[PDB]
Structures are given as C-alpha cells and as structure tokens.
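Predicting holo structure, magnesium ion bound.
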Amino acid sequence: SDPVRQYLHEIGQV
Amino acid sequence: TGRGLSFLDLIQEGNQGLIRAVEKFEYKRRFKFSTYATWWIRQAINRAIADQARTIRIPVHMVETINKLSRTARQLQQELGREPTYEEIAEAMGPGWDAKRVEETLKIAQEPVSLETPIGDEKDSFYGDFIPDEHLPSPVDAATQSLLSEELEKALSKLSEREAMVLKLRKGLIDGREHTLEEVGAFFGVTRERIRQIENKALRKLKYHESRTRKLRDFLD
Amino acid sequence: KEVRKVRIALASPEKIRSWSYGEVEKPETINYRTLKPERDGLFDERIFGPIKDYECACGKYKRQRFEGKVCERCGVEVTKSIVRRYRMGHIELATPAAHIWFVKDVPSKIG
Amino acid sequence: PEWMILEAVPVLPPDLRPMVQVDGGRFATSDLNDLYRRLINRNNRLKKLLAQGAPEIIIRNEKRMLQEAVDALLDNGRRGAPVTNPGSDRPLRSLTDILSGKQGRFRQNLLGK
Amino acid sequence: MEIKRFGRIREVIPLPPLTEIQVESYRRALQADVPPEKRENVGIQAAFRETFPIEELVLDFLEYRLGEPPFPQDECREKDLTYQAPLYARLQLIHKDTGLIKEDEVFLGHIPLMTEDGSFIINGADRVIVSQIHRSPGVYFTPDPARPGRYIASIIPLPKRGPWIDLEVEPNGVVSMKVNKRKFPLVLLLRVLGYDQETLARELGAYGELVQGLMDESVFAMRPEEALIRLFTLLRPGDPPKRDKAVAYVYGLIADPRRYDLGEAGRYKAEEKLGIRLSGRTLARFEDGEFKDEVFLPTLRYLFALTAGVPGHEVDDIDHLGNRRIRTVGELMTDQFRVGLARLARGVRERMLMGSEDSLTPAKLVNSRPLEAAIREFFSRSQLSQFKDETNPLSSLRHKRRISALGPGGLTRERAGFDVRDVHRTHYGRICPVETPEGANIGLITSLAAYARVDELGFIRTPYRRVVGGVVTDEVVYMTATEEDRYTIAQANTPLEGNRIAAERVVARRKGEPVIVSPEEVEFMDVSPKQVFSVNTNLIPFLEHDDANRALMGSNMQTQAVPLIRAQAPVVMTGLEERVVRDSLAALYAEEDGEVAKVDGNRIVVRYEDGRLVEYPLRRFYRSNQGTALDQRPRVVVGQRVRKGDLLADGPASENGFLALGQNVLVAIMPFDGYNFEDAIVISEELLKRDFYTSIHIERYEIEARDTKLGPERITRDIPHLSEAALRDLDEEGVVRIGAEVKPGDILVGRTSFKGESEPTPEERLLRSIFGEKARDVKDTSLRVPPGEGGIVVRTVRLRRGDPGVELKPGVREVVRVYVAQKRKLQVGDKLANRHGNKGVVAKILPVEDMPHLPDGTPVDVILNPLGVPSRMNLGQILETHLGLAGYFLGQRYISPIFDGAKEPEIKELLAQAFEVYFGKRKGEGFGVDKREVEVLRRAEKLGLVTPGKTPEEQLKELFLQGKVVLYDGRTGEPIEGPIVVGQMFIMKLYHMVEDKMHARSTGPYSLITQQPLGGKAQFGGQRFGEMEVWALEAYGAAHTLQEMLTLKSDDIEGRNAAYEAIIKGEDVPEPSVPESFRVLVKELQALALDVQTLDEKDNPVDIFEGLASK
DNA sequence: CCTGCATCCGTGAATCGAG
DNA sequence: TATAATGGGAGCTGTCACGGATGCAGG
Ligand SMILES: N=C(N)NCC(=O)N(O)[C@@H](CCC(N)=O)C(=O)NC[C@H]1O[C@@H](c2c[nH]c(=O)[nH]c2=O)[C@H](O)[C@@H]1O
Ligand SMILES: [Mg+2]
Ligand SMILES: [Mg+2]
Ligand SMILES: [Mg+2]
Ligand SMILES: [Zn+2]
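Done. Tokens:
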C-alpha cells in the first residue's frame, strides 16, 4: 500500500 | 527531503553510500561503525541531490558555486534589509567576481518550467498552447523558397547552358557543392582562368538582367 | 498504397527494440552551457535525429549531398530534422516491469 | 501474454515531448522528460546495486520503486498517489492523461481541430 | 439643474464604508500602527505566537516590526515592483542548559501592503484579494441519508488545521468515530480520555437502548494507557506501538493547539451548540500527565439526545449564514503566513541540531526564504488573488466586495452542486440574491449587501431598528443569521408617524417566513430596502418593476461600463451615485474648510484653515488594467472657497461628484425597418458629432533586449533592408517619437538580433553573389503594431542596464515600453446597454435626416425595439423613459430610491407640467394643430388611448401623460400611424467593442506537438472546429469541406504548404495527405508499448512515416 | 456449497470565447 | 575517508450516480 511504510517494516525485522 | 529527490530515492542513495562505507571500513580503529558510515552516507546523498535534481544537469562544482551564491545573497539580504544588487554580491563574493559574472551564473541556474503549467482557474488551458513552433517552415516560407528557386532558374535560362552550369557548380545549386576553379576547369575542359572568366561574364549578365527585369529584387529579404 | 485498415496489438520487446534507434542510457537533457543535446541522453541527436536539416552535430556534414551518411566523429545521421518527431528510443530495464494498464484495468487480464 | 510485462520500455520521440526556449530566452519542457528521468535514474541505480551486489532488502525496494516509476510514466495517479514536481501539487501529465480525458489527444486534436 | 427626490422612508444610518471589508481587515491582521507592547494576539502576531518558541537550544520570539515601503505606490506601478514593507523580528536565542542568551533582529523579507482603496500591487499590477466563504468550524448534526432515524455528527475545525471527525451510530449498535478515512468504536477513544463505565452511565443513562451499544466490557478491561496503545494500532498499522510514540500522534491529532485548531468562531459556535465552555480551541487536552476530555462527551450527548427524539435538539442547515462564515483578506494572508512561518520553524529545528552546538546566532539560524515564498505564492498564483477590475470606479468597488466559495479550502467546481448555489432565507440583508455571474460560477461568486458588514468571528451582520411597543428607536443593532432567527422583524416601508408605528397589521418576518402581525408583537424593523441588495443592484432605479434576471444583467453590466469623456450622471438616480464615487477613490475632496490657491490640469493647490499649503497632484491619462483611461478633472476655479468634504477634482466616470457610467440620450421605443430586430439597436449620427459614447483606451507595448549566446540584442534605429519611409517616426535610438500616429505594420521599437547559425541555401548564396551585397550580420526583430490596433504614442518608458536605479532579470539588457492610446467613437458592433437589463449592439448609424423626429424638429438619439420589453419583463426602463421625458422638458433630474421611489400618479403630474412647456411654447409661437397630428389623434382615439370629442390639445395631453408623443418619420415626412413612447434613458457603452474582438487569420503560428494552429486573437490563432462542428459537416454530408478542416486547413503540413503555394500560383489545391496529429497519436500509442499499424486490403503494413521510422 | 443482496472502486459529467 | 549518531510525515474531508467486480451471510 504505502511504499515508505512498507520499507520501514522490512527494516524493522533486522 | 525536499531538495528535488523523493524520500525513497534519498534512502536508496544512502544505501549506496552505506555499501561504500562497509567495504572501506577498518574495525581495528575501535570506531563505532555508525561514525564512519555516516560520512559516506551523507556524501552519497549529497552527490545524488547535486546530480539528479536539475532537469538541465549541472556539474557538482558549479552547483556548489551557485549554492554559495545563494548563501551569499541571503546573508546580504539579511543584513541590508533588501535584495542585493549584482555588484553588492560581486563584492561579498571576493576577487574574480563582478556584476557581469554574477548575472551569468544566475542565468545558468535558471531551471525550465513545465509546458503543462495551468493557464487560468479552469483546467481547459495549458501553457504550451500559447507557444508557436519556430522550427517548421510556415507555408509562406516554403512558397517563397520555391518561388526563389523558380525565379533563379528563370534567370539562369537567360544565359547559355555552359555559363549557367559553371555558376550552378560554383555556388552549389546542382549537387549541392561549391567547387573551386580547378574542378570546374577539369570538367568543362578549359583553364581555371577561363572558368573564372565565364563566371564573371555570367554574373555580370545576371546583373544586367536584374537591372532591367526587376524580378529577383523582392527576394533580397 | 492506400490505407484501408488500422490494427492495434501488443508490442513485443523485440518489436520495441526494432522501433528504437538507440538506448537512452543517461537522464541528461542538454548541456548547461552549450544548450546542445547531451550524448546518450533523452535528446541525443545520434539516436533520434539531427536538429538542423541535412547537418550533423559537429558540423562535418552540412549538405544534402551525403544522405544516409552517418558522421563518424559526431555520430549523427544527416537527414531532415523532421525525423525527431517519429523516431522511437528505448530503455532496457534490469527487472522486467508490468504494464499497469493490464494490471489495474478490472477485470485484470493478467489476474 | 508475457508482452503484458515490459522488458524494454519505449521512449517517445523528443519533438513530441519537446524542450524549447521561449520568447524571454527561458526554457520550457514537458512533464514526460521528468518522468523518463525518474525511470532512467532508478533503473541505472538498480543496475549498479546489482553489479556491486546488495542485500535483497535494498534490491527489493529499488525494484518496487522501479515499478512505481513505470506506472508513473504510463498512467500517473492510477496506482496510489500521483507523482509531482517538488513544491508543486500538480500531478505530472502521463501518456494516459495525454491520450484519454476531455483534453485528450482524441477529443481535443483528433475529433476537432 | 434642480434635483427632485421622492420616498417617505428616512434611513437612519448611512451605508458603512464600502471598502471596509478590505482595509479594516488587513489592518486588524497587521497591527503595524499598534505599539508592539500593546498588541493583541491576531493575524501576524498570532502567527508568531503560535509558531514560537522552538523546543529542540531554545529560540524564543519577542516582537516584530514593519518599516516603511521602499517605494511609493505609483513608483511600484511604474517600475513593475511590489508594494510592500520590510519585516523585522526580535529573537533571543536561549540555551536551555548553559543559559546563554544571544539576541538579534532578523530580516524576514517584505510583506505586501494594502492601498487606501483596499487593493494591492503585485509586481506592477493592481490586484484584489477576494474574500472566501466556507462552512464555519464547530459541531453539526446532519440527518443520515441512508437511515431515516439515525444521524451523522460532524466535528469540523479550521481549514488545513486538523481532520474532520464523524460520529455515527452503526446498525450493529456501537457508535463509530471516523478520522482520516479510518473508522473505529468511539468507546476506545472515550476510554483514553479517562472515562469509565460509571461516568458514561450517569451522564448518558437518560437515553435507553442507546448507551448499551456504547457499553463494551472488553474496553474497560484495559487501562487508559493500554487503550491508547490499542487505538494507535488501529490508526497506525505497521508502526510500532511505542507509548511515547502513541502519545505524540494522538496528542498531535487532537489536543495539540499548534496542529489542531478550531476557529475562535468555531469555539463559540461549539460552546453555544453544546451549552458548554471551551478553555482552548482543541477537542481535548494533555494535562497532569494524561488526556482530559473537552468536546467528545458533550457532542455524543447531543447526538444520542437527537436520535432519541429529546426536545431541544435540532439538526443544522449548512447553507444557513449562521453556520457559514467569511475569511477576509487578513485571515487568508495570515493563514498562508502561518504556513510559511511553520516551514521556517522546520528550518530552525533542522539547523539547531546541525553545525555548531556552541556558536550560533538568531541571524545564522534563520532562513527567510520559506516565509517569502509562501507570502509571494499567496499574492501571485493564488485563485483568490485576482486581477483588479479597473474598468470604472464601480468595477473595482464591487470587486472588493466579491465573495467566493472557491479557492484553497473552498469548493471545487465539480464538488459544488446547486444546493449551495441557491439563495437562502438568511441571505436577506447579507448576500445579494441578484448579483452573481451567469457563468459556471453562479451561486458560488456573490456580492456583499450594502448595509451588511462582517464581524470578528467572520459572520455577516445586518442592521435592524430597535422597536419596543410602538416606538421605533434610532439605535441600530447588527445581528447574525442565528440571532436574527430569534425575533420578529417588520418591513421598512411600514407606516410610521414620527417614531410610532401607524399600521394596524404590519408585514413582518419570522425566521424568513412572512407573517401579518400586530404592532405589539414587533421586536425589530428593517433599516432600509437598500440593505437587501448589493451596491450595483442599488444603482438600478425602479428595480421593483424589473425581472430578477434582467436585474442581474443590469448589476453586472454597470461593472462593464467604459468611462466616457462626455459621461454624465443619469437623469433618474437612486441616490447612491455620489456615495459610490465617495467610497471609491476616483474623485478628490478637501480635507478641511479653506480656499483654493491654484487650479491646473496637473495639480490643485489649496490653503486650509490651518494655513498650511496642500498640493494635490492629479492622475491624468493613466492606463488601467483593462485599458480604460483613468484621469482626474478639476472641478474648481482659482480662489474658490470650499468646505470639509467638497469636490475638488472629478475622477473617471464621474460628473459633479455623481457616478457617470453612461449618457442620458433621447430614446424612442419603436420598430425600425428590422434594424432593431432581436435586441439590435439603431443610433443617430449626432451621437458621434457631439462625441457621445466616446472613450479613450490605452494599450501597453513592451519589448526586451536580452543577452543571447549568439550575441546581444540591440535596440537601434538601424534596421537592415528597410525604407526610410518606414523609419519616419522613430528617433535616433530606435524608439518611436511621442505623439506620432501608428498603424498596423508600423514599427514601435526597432531591435536587431544576430542570425542563427545556418548554411545559407545555394539559392541564397547565388542571390547574394548576384546583387553584390553581403548579407547583414544581424536580423530584424521589431515590436510592430498588431493587426486591428494602433493610435497615438503618449509615453515611452526606457529601462536599461548599467544606468542607475534599474536592474532587470538575468540575461536582459534593456526593457522598453511604449504607451499607445486612442479615442474610440461609437461604431457598428459596439455594445450598448441600460441599468434595467436591456442590452444590444449598434446595428445601424443613421444620418440625422433619416431619424424619427419630434414635431418641433428634434430628432431622437436611440431607436429601441419594443419587442425586447414584454418577454424580458423589465418595465423599469419604461418608467425611466417616462420620468426622463418629463425631466427632459422641465430640465430637472430626479432621485428615485429602490422600492421607495416615485409612483405613477406623481410621474403623471411631472409629465403634465412638462406638457405645458411642450405645447404652450407652440401655441404661444402662433402655431395650431398639425394635420398629421390630427390623423395620429384619430387613430389614437380608435386605439382608445384618448377620449373622443375632446380638443386636440386635451388629447395630445392625454397621450403625453401616457408617455407617448407624436413622431414624424424623417424619410417620409408622414407621421407614424400611432403615438410612440419617447423620453430620456440612461444608456451605457460596455467594454465589449468590435475593435477589441474582430479577428481573421489566413495562416499563422502552429503548436509544437500537435502542429495545429494556435488559438485566440492575441496569438493570431485560428478558430476551433470542435467535434460538434464536425457533426454539423457530417450531418450535411460535406466530406471535402470536413477533410479540408482535418488536413489542409490545419494539421497536414505538406498539404497546407502545397495548398498555399497552389492558391498563390492560381492552381487548384492538392489532394490532402495524412494529418500530423494522427502520427502523434501513433507514436504516443507506441510509447504505451502498443503497436498501431496502417494496412491495405491485403493486410500488408502501410508506412505513413515514409521510411523515416523504420531502420 | 450456490443464489441473492450489500458494497466497493472507477468512471463519467454541453459548446465556443479569453486567460 | 573515522566521537557517536540506527522505523516518515502530512493528510484536504460540502458531488453523484452509474456499471461491474468482491465478498458477505443465508437457504
Ligand atoms: N455569460 C452568460 N453565459 N450569459 C448567458 C446569457 O446572457 N444568455 O442570454 C443565455 C441564457 C440566458 C441567461 N442569462 O440565463 C442565452 O440564452 N444565450 C443565447 C444562446 O447562447 C447559448 C448559450 C448561452 N449561455 C451558456 O452558458 N451556454 C450556451 O450555450 C445558447 O445556445 C443560447 O440559446
Ligand atoms: Mg568581487
Ligand atoms: Mg491567481
Ligand atoms: Mg449501484
Ligand atoms: Zn558530424
């Protein structure tokens, strides 16, 4: 949905 | 953010700098990685903003110059209570800077504007709709050019075929090439001075034809 | 020949490249000083065509004598500048991307 | 069916997306140029990120941005938010916006002149 | 001349300052004349206070100040500068740890100042900031269009500040709350506020079957913090539910005074609606470590009480002017000032954490550019920032009283709907029900009523006379729409003897609805009939006798009236004609009592009671925005002793202080040989002889000599390949001399530019070689006269570079402007119109002998068609003609107030008195009755217009009382077979003239991409042949005419060049080729990766690009 | 498991002028 | 090329009525 928020989620995993 | 590149564009460019930082890092120095990474990250981001922002791409050093001119003019406008003159900025810039060079620099930094720029408070009009095409020939131009070629051929028929061919080869009406006297003499079979003589006679005949007929005069533009 | 029909169809990648007169490698437009088309840019003359009629970029070939002749030094063909209206370019993507028309037009054709 | 996915994105001829110098010596250009520059930038960066090698997280985001750029070119505002010029709220004019619409190529220039 | 007036109504208060909505608003937002220490918190001051201080080093705000304009007004109009003032700000940088305090005054740029009349100057152009109308902030309850018994609750803050909140009862029983396109149970939000099941049970328990849906055991099972985290997971999915993060978002969304802001008006509206009081302008607060409620509980209370059917709870009309407010110039500029100041604050916060954490000053830390850009944006490319209408003084006067529903935060044209476009009962006295554009903006753009003003909250208030018992007090009370709905307000024309009500049953209003009521039940009374309509609508006499539609036309067209050189005030006025030229700064008056020293066309010098000598420079022949010449004319002589507020110099469109939008002409209402067929108008040549309807128009012609990479552009008298006959009126510098006459094709300013580099075609090379003249290095690019224009050069402004005082935009060497004016007489095609809505064009200019004339030999000026009257239903011009006729022979003017004006019997009386002058002169000169007058009388008594048997003088009087006289056809000498209505009518010459409009094009400029002809007269463009015009040709079956338009006459390049070549060669046009615009379509479709191929019947591809697109 | 109704998203919304 | 720094920021809320696709509970 939101590219910025999605990338922020993919970053919070590590 | 807000410097011409999107948020994600900046992040990815900082990721490039992050990669550069990782490969150039030395752990023996006991420095926390964040310290050495930050430098390369900022460096990659700034390089990206300097390169990708302007539609008309401008070298990084020239951008630093323009931005230096921005901070200079803003410093002066903040102290003088008004917008600075070209000469005032030229002073505060130091040596090598006059009003002329400042104005030139500003002219370079000018960015293009969108052709889809709205005209009016409705959406039925665009900016590019009011811009004529300067390249493609108007029907008047093409017609005039054709009339010039026809009138010139009508003028070259008042000569013989030989003395007109010398001129057609000399100025490049035929084949589209201007020849020296040696080539035209190598073709017709006479000496170069004979060719220059024929071209003098032909031009002089065309002068007398022009003085009498008054036809080609209007095409002088 | 007279036109009696008009066909519309999907363009194959090879057909897209067949249309293209060159790949646009750099997102440059024109030089910030010379105001001339930057090489391998969106306005590059070597790809789309000459700005001046029957004249190449560096000005080595200025006439209609040589037509179809590609300048060796500059790299631009000498023809009518009208070709810059009709000549397609292309961009080879690293990862193949989906044409949004066939993705978002309900009911989705790909879906 | 695999032609519905683009390996090579076409480029419209320069004169149909012109960059011209107006009366005052200033420059004016089409939004398609900014769109294509978006595409080339994100594409070239992806090719570099692949060449030097990068974690799949970074490559993923770069790919997702590439699709966003392709969509922006073909049909702006179609998927999610429209791409705009900095400082402006005005969405760029995409190929879909040029063809379709009441101001489109069909209604404005083809069915009337 | 004598000025006789009518009416029994004595209006107590005079009309308020007409430009007050501009000046008093902007000044209130600035407080520049207010000492900083005594400044209140509004506008610019409120912006500084709301944006300051900056948390994280602490930068604090002290006070601001505004210097004087760097240039005067007329100097800004001249040099294309902006009328503005320097803005300085006192700031003290305070370190929250060290305690270091560094104080300095930073410069934030300039702020545009408003002129006296209420307009602005943006880069050398007068601009009017139009007020905006929008839904007032507060809490409204609108019925749900889906469920009849259920209602929608809406919580609305100021535009751009905070989201809208929707409280709705779902079919599943639970109350929902909608914020930023997100719905959730309101129960959770209530829990975060610190509410419990106890508090909600005792408070809302009055209404059963409702609060049980608000009851949820799983909600009270968690603490306020847990519920807060739960809510953050609802509003912000994917974002980590950190406590302080959730606090920050929710607080910023609701309780934050800086982010979320109700209107001070909306604050009061919410207080009165919910019967409570609000401490701040936020829906909630952050106090003592948690969230405390303010708005949500009383709103939910009212909502449930509304659904249950509990008395004392109503829905809200959103078109009600008690729920609709006005954002004036001051508030609009303030809001944009707030945005720009907020961006500057972001720059401050950014630069504090960067650079030196030790050595920083307020000067270093401040970037003024965001603020400058924001202000400059609002004053330039904003919609509400419009080009000032300087046609006539009334134009700009109305322009400043315009009200728009559009612009930022307003309505989109598609988002409109005609619910808001209609007239409301609350528009009474506030917004004019007549004045509006008949375009797409109808209902959206309106004008403010005369007696109406806007209060501090933003609502429109109207004056009303206090009535207690039968006595009407001279005091006046300005009321809002909500307040007006409380009382019973009678009519202004209700009978009053002294201060006492006379009538037994008066006509009154209760909440808009008319009611016949007793004088004991009358609480208030209309001040004047004039308060119901706008200023322009007040300038129309006999308004009550006109249809509302043509009244709209009259009000709109008076704005379009061009100031004539012989312009005169109307014979029949309404009384506001002087006041208009008063509030508008067209005229000129004396400040105090005194005597006149000097009188000139350039200046007027006056010595006052003070003894001080004041000199007034006069504006003469200055070009306005529309081209109408604005000049002031002296009306006093040397030594004239004047008083306070006496006329010194008449401005544009003004006669002796009164407004002159047209001229009083002798009209005749009769058909005339079909020349007045369908609204057309026939005029006399005499109107041109004595220069009636003649006006001066000026046009501004600019040219720029810039720096090119191919060489400089030089403005000089030297132009290659030109005849001396063409260089006649130029001076030695290339500029045309002042006072010369210029025609289409002539050169205003000569300029040369170096040719673009190109191989001269072999034909040109040979041509140069033959004529023995080398090609000139430069090329002629001269500012010439556009086709259909011209006049006399009155002024030349030349700006350069290197010379003092002037510096142009980068690249430009010198800017030269030429001012060419012209006096325009009335010609066939120009548009004439009156105040009653009657409009038309001049179709014929007859010689004076062809003109229908009076028995005494006086020819009429204008011939109007009677057919235009009945269908259009505007009888005002008829009465204007009657009273104009009586005033024509009596030689006196009149004042007829709207709805209070003169009535028929009085007009009959004045007509009779005029008849005595008419016929009494004749019979005294020894002239009996004409034989043609006898025949006319015969057909008149057959018409039943006069009583049979009476003497001709008695019959001619009977006709004259009806407004009809005997007319003689100038062509025949025979009379018209019937009596015709003749009299003086006030007719205006509108801005729409054939000189500005007429255009024709053979060939010209073509667009870039489409390569089709441009559009408009200015660009020398072609006429648009739309798809409807295509249909017209198709329906006809004219294929080759349509194919012409689609190819040769527009888009086909080769075809049109060969076409033009064919016509000038006498040869027939060539077969049309395939259009370029289709080729554009093909390639644009290829850019979409779609293959488009043209084929033959063999299904073999056909190349329309002729090999140019194939490798 | 398959029909029917509620509901979602995307698409339209007159012409020509000027601006 | 080196103190250490490690999940964003502003939303636009007063059109409307249509076709068609998605999804839901109900027989
Ligand atoms: N500024 C505008 N549009 N004024 C409208 C106007 O003066 N008219 O006379 C309008 C409507 C009457 C009115 N005032 O409401 C009118 O009837 N003009 C005559 C013709 O002009 C055409 C027309 C007028 N106004 C429009 O908005 N669209 C139209 O197509 C119609 O074909 C119409 O038959
Ligand atoms: Mg210097
Ligand atoms: Mg504007
Ligand atoms: Mg439906
Ligand atoms: Zn070359």
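The first helix of chain C runs from residue 13 to 19.
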